[PDB]
Amino acid sequence: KSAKLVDGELLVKASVESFGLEDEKYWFLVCCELSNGKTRQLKRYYQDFYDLQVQLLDAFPAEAGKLRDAGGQWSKRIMPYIPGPVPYVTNSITKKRKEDLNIYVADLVNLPDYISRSEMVHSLFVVLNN
3-class secondary-structure state, position 29:
strand
- Residues 120, 121, 126, 127: is their CA dihedral positive or negative? positive
Phi, psi of 96 (to 5 degrees): -65, -35
- Please give the tally of structural domains in the chain: 1
Query: Cβ-count burial of 87 within 10 angstroms (0-12 exposed, 13-18 middle, 19+ buried)?
Result: exposed
User: What are 42's strand-pairing partners?
Assistant: 30
Domain of 41: which CATH number? 3.30.1520.10
Q: By the 8 A CB rule, do 45 and 60 touch? A: no
Domain containing 95 equals 1-130
21: CB partners within 8 A, 6+ apart? 27
Phi-psi label, residue 71: left if phi above 0, alpha if psi -120 to 50, beta otherwise: left
Q: Please state, in angstroms and rounded to a whole number, the distance separating the CA atoms of residues 103 and 75.
A: 20
